[PDB]
Design a protein around this ligand. Structure first.
Ligand SMILES: *Cc1c(COP(=O)(O)O)cnc(C)c1O
Ligand SMILES: *Cc1c(COP(=O)(O)O)cnc(C)c1O
Lengths: 375, 373
């Protein structure tokens, strides 16, 4: 019964570097469209699948930016945050013993959503030497004939890695050969740096039929507290997820759907996303310099707004290194072990905080690294 | 495993609408705009904002006599509808039974199937003004029964359980060591001699009770998706664990507007105005339905009325099929709310007075015309 699956799941001056959301505020003009919606009286229930005009704007964005062709009436569904998608998506198909492969270090909702859907998560390590990009040769070590799905997250949280098109082509070969469904969490697609490119696995030939691509407004617009996300997937999966929603949150907030549908079509939205991306890029270069500078070897992340320094050479546990940085440096970083077994030996730092707080946090980490001769 | 249980599930004047026709009171809309300007745009606690939980805790104390701790026993949800799946998922085990009074709201049985149990319908009867009767509950309990869901004022019937009904069902609940889920979203829309009481306020009941309520029906906020439950700590702790892998948290600036609205005089004023208008409409449709030849119990709460249709010789489904194309009015077959709903139709009077009168004339013209009386 679900209560059974739920008990198998667990878990003054101080700079928090543990944040997993934009420090920016929602762009003013998106605030303004939600005020207009309230005044227009968009107060009542909407369809379980989302407002058709939001789904249509989302079909346009997916085709033009991601190369995905999805039908608005049938294949895309609006959600209360992209987070709902893991449990509801996996529940449209996962049966009782089935395994889902999760590349690790991974976002924290993946494995519990698998356990709640009734399956068994199987962690597949990614490695520092590979700049944490998934390798299909690790996938092979873990396939069984109970494997039904793979979850991919690019750009990745906690790592900041982004899969290249060739990476995705190989993954696409493995998935088709093993007849898996891929769930692709793309919420960080627009925060990509240097010469990285965001490719969607559902745009490759023959792949839409087998992937659930999840995305949302939370990170690319700074709308985490607005609870609006979406999936584009085959209609037999969408059908099952809206039936689930009927008995869960019924439908998204309908005036926020209006604000967001207009926002996708507004030039100033995209302009604000580049503002934010240029500023996250500036902060990234600082924490990458400074962390390598103080002795913690760190891969330059190509996407999202997280960086993942190697702390294992200080001789500590990622949990003990988190304690020591909080007690003595008063900076909060999250243990890499919280992102799966392959995260032990690292710590997640979010640079979604003001440049200046990051500078100061970096000096404070330095001093107790030197002071406590951990180097 | 949840996939198998999903598999087990599921010129007209529409009278089938289950939501307020009113728009949200303007002052609540402005509190929302203000939260937006104040930047209340980021993630909040999974259990919901503490300001909102403290506000809900004084409302529950004052209006309902339920004492609950804002820190551990109140949780904000994305509509009250989340409470049934998530609340049942805190304790229900495989194949345990949940008693469901019928005619009932459509979420309850699918919510117990998704959670892993089996719904057992318990009939309510028009002779009893559709108030759940304990003798009927005695016939259906088993050693597999773990919970009971009650809904007062009730959708689809409009029935509201008496303080003595509650006292007797409370008895039954303790005797059978069940937990009760109490759906109280229509609490402010009660009429005539009716009074709303909360089963968690009685004698030792808080510990055995999940009470769900929200802002959708009382403040005309159905599209805002804000509801709440007050329940013991161990139920709340498991429901916010579930929310972390579900919708994460309600929308922050909506929560602030709801908090400021519980405290505003104009909110409670808005509610008497909507209650006064629904009562006017209710008198109209109860009168018109009986005199038109359809024996109808005068509902005492919510905004729904449930006329007897079976003496026309039609089934609930055939009668609404007839009314949709002959009268152009949409009513919903009683059989959609359980099998004790057969022979009846739910009409909602959450539409304008004028359209209700019109709708009533259209139904009366086709009743007399196909000699259905
Ligand atoms: C923030 C985030 C999400 C959740 O999106 P919400 O819309 O806020 O529910 C999903 N995936 C990752 C990897 C994220 O970091
Ligand atoms: C409308 C209604 C609800 C509340 O659903 P929301 O999710 O809050 O919109 C719950 N129960 C009943 C009986 C209802 O009629």
């Amino acid at each position: 019964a679900l209560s059974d699956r739920l008990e198998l799941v667990s878990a003054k001056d101080v700079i928090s570097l543990g944040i997993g959301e934009p420090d920016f505020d929602t762009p003013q003009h998106i605030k303004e469209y939600a005020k207009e919606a309230l005044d227009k009286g968009l107060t009542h229930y909407g369809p379980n699948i989302g407002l058709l005009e939001l789904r249509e704007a989302i079909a346009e964005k997916l085709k033009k930016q991601n190369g995905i062709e999805a039908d608005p009436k049938t294949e895309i569904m609006v959600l209360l945050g992209a987070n709902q998608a893991f449990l509801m998506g996996l529940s449209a198909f996962l049966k009782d013993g089935e395994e889902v492969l999760i590349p690790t270090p991974a976002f924290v909702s993946y494995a519990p959503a698998v356990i709640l859907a009734g399956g068994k998560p199987v962690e597949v390590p990614t490695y520092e030497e590979d700049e944490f990009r998934l390798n299909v040769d690790e996938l092979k070590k873990y396939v069984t004939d109970k494997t039904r799905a793979l979850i991919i997250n690019s750009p990745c949280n906690p790592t900041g890695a982004v899969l290249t098109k060739k990476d995705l082509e190989e993954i696409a070969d493995f998935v088709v050969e093993h007849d898996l469904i891929v769930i692709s969490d793309e919420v960080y697609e627009h925060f990509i740096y240097d010469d990285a490119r965001h490719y969607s696995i559902a745009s490759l030939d023959g792949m839409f039929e087998r992937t659930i691509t999840v995305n949302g407004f939370s990170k690319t617009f700074a709308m985490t507290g607005w609870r609006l996300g979406f999936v584009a997937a085959p209609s037999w999966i969408i059908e099952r997820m809206v039936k689930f929603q009927m008995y869960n949150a019924t439908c998204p907030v309908t005036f926020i759907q209006y604000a967001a549908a207009k926002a996708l079509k507004d030039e100033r939205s995209w302009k604000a996303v580049e503002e934010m991306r240029k500023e996250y890029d500036r902060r990234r270069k600082l924490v990458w310099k400074r962390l390598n500078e103080m002795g913690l070897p760190t891969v330059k992340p190509k996407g999202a707004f997280y960086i993942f320094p190697r702390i294992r050479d200080t001789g500590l546990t990622s949990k003990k290194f988190s304690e020591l940085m909080l007690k003595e440096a008063r900076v909060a970083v999250v243990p890499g072990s919280a992102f799966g077994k392959a995260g032990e030996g690292y710590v997640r730092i979010s640079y979604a905080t003001a440049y200046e707080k990051l500078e100061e946090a970096m000096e404070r980490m330095e001093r107790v690294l030197k002071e406590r001769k951990l180097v």
